[PDB]
Design an enzyme around this catalytic site. Structure first.
Site, PDB file in Angstrom:
ATOM      1  N   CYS A 224     -13.782  27.661   7.665  1.00  0.00           N
ATOM      2  CA  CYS A 224     -13.990  26.439   6.886  1.00  0.00           C
ATOM      3  C   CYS A 224     -15.196  25.655   7.389  1.00  0.00           C
ATOM      4  O   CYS A 224     -15.987  25.140   6.587  1.00  0.00           O
ATOM      5  CB  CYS A 224     -12.734  25.560   6.921  1.00  0.00           C
TER       6      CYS A 224
ATOM      7  N   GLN B 161       6.584  15.969   9.537  1.00  0.00           N
ATOM      8  CA  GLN B 161       5.672  14.833   9.429  1.00  0.00           C
ATOM      9  C   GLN B 161       6.424  13.559   9.057  1.00  0.00           C
ATOM     10  O   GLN B 161       6.081  12.466   9.526  1.00  0.00           O
ATOM     11  CB  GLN B 161       4.571  15.139   8.408  1.00  0.00           C
TER      12      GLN B 161
ATOM     13  N   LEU C  51       0.840  -1.188   0.000  1.00  0.00           N
ATOM     14  CA  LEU C  51       0.000   0.000   0.000  1.00  0.00           C
ATOM     15  C   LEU C  51       0.880   1.243   0.000  1.00  0.00           C
ATOM     16  O   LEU C  51       1.813   1.344   0.804  1.00  0.00           O
ATOM     17  CB  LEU C  51      -0.911   0.009   1.234  1.00  0.00           C
TER      18      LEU C  51
ATOM     19  N   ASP D 123       5.681  13.076  -7.605  1.00  0.00           N
ATOM     20  CA  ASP D 123       6.282  13.206  -8.933  1.00  0.00           C
ATOM     21  C   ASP D 123       7.615  12.474  -9.042  1.00  0.00           C
ATOM     22  O   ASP D 123       8.051  12.186 -10.159  1.00  0.00           O
ATOM     23  CB  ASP D 123       6.451  14.687  -9.327  1.00  0.00           C
TER      24      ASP D 123
ATOM     25  N   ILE E 261      -0.075   8.394  -0.306  1.00  0.00           N
ATOM     26  CA  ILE E 261       0.483   9.612  -0.882  1.00  0.00           C
ATOM     27  C   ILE E 261       0.060  10.778   0.001  1.00  0.00           C
ATOM     28  O   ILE E 261      -1.100  11.201  -0.024  1.00  0.00           O
ATOM     29  CB  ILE E 261       0.028   9.831  -2.331  1.00  0.00           C
TER      30      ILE E 261
END
Ligand SMILES: Nc1ncnc2c1ncn2[C@@H]1O[C@H](CSCC[C@H](N)C(=O)O)[C@@H](O)[C@H]1O
Ligand SMILES: [Cl-]
Length: 279
Positions: free
Chosen positions: A261, A95, A64, A120, A67
């Site tokens: 938000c 992170q 797995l 990328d 991303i």
């Protein structure tokens, strides 16, 4: 552009400790999934990760890719609940180090990799992809390359779960009765300075151009309103510590971002979708 360089205080400069003032213990920074109405934030964040992972049809021994793994909560659920190898990638060094240290403590009979790396540059073959909250950091000029690279590194039976925030067109808003006000407009300007979003239709278009099929989209609009509400309540509860670690200006900017938000999801200006893509 100001003529003199000014080392300013940015919302991006805060520590992991600052985020721990309002995120749940898993440090998920994306929409939770209140599968049960009485779930705590932590339970709903785990349920959101489980929701995404379950859609991938993981089998023992697969690999797995996450991303945009953030602070690693998705990969922990994957390691704990599936007998799979995992790879997590992120562009954030904080992170990266945090996820590496977190997952190093989890017993496992499979491979675990955490990398400071953008999609990328990623070329490893993987069986399944999950990506939660990363797409909204991509520029639209790179959308096609993202779906093409995702398609290319997957096998024939491959599946991808793409979770990202969404906006509506003006026509859809007028249809749905959502009236955008001046204060909404001023908040969108605040976002463009301190921080355009795709519509659901755009995701379909770009995924299909890369030869994916969209098997499912699931919308979590009001789950995000609740997620942002809790984050805001936690940060406000920890206001004094937030100001000591940072400043009242940084505290206010986060509080404005979170509650603004929240309003956009509650009012219906924004949404958030999980897209199951198949090959
Ligand atoms: N081009 C890119 N390639 C890889 N990771 C990226 C990226 N652009 C942003 N990211 C990463 O995507 C993440 C978005 S934050 C979401 C983190 C996590 N999925 C969660 O649900 O909490 C961050 O880790 C950020 O560094
Ligand atoms: Cl801090």
């Amino acid at each position: 552009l100001r003529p003199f360089y000014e080392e300013s205080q940015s919302i991006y400069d805060v520590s992991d400790e600052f985020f721990s003032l309002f995120l749940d213990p898993t440090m998920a920074y994306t929409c939770a999934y209140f599968e049960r109405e009485d779930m705590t934030l932590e339970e709903a964040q785990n349920a959101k990760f489980d929701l995404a992972l379950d859609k991938l049809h993981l089998e023992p021994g697969m690999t797995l890719l996450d991303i945009g793994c953030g602070w690693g909560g998705g990969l922990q659920r994957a390691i704990e609940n599936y007998d799979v190898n995992v790879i997590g990638i992120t562009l954030s060094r904080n992170q990266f180090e945090y996820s590496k240290a977190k997952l190093a403590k989890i017993p496992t009979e499979r491979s675990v990799q955490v990398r400071l790396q953008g999609w990328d540059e990623f070329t490893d073959k993987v069986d399944r992809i999950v990506s939660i909250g990363a797409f909204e950091a991509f520029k639209m000029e790179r959308y096609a390359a993202f779906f093409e690279r995702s398609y290319d590194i997957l096998p024939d039976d491959g599946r991808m779960l793409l979770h990202t925030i969404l906006t509506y067109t003006q026509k859809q808003m007028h249809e749905m009765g959502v009236k955008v006000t001046m204060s909404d407009v001023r908040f969108m300007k605040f976002i463009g300075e301190e921080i355009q979003l795709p519509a659901q239709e755009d995701i379909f278009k770009f995924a299909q151009a890369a030869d994916f099929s969209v098997e499912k989209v699931q919308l979590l609009q009001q789950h995000y309103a609740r997620t942002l509400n809790i984050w805001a309540a936690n940060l406000e509860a920890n206001k004094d510590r937030a100001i000591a670690l940072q400043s009242e200006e940084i505290y206010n900017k986060y509080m404005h971002y979170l509650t603004g938000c929240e309003h956009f999801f509650r009012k219906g200006i924004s949404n958030v979708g999980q897209f199951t893509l198949t090959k």
